[PDB]
């Protein structure tokens, strides 16, 4: 899976229940386009997203049950490299 928008950060791979899990979405010299973020898992995780002002987005989700969460990141209907990701969220 290679390449355009990219995503990296701890929240893409692991987290802990009831604490915010975070990762970054780098849109430096992406076109213009639609960025989709979704998270699927054993609970409805609240997503928050702040523009860091430098072409980078800082994204966190708040998982309330432990388990596996799929993080899906698409740019213009296409999967970013590594998307869908899988975060092991422990208790």
């Amino acid at each position: 899976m290679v390449n355009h928008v990219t995503a990296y950060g701890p929240g893409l791979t692991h987290g802990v229940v009831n604490k915010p899990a975070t990762f970054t979405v780098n849109t430096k010299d992406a076109g213009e386009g639609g960025l989709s973020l979704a998270i699927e898992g054993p609970s409805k995780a609240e997503i928050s997203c702040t523009d860091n002002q430098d072409g980078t987005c800082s994204v966190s989700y708040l998982p309330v049950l432990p388990g596996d969460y799929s993080i899906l990141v698409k740019y213009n209907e296409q999967h970013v490299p590594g998307s869908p990701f899988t975060a092991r969220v422990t208790g």
Binding site: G34, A38, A45, I47
Partner: peptide, 17 residues
């Protein structure tokens, strides 16, 4: 996947210079 209920949270952003 499928044994327990699964939920989705979503966000869509338009990115533009």
């Amino acid at each position: 996947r499928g044994s327990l209920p699964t939920f989705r949270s979503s966000l869509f952003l338009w990115v533009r210079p």
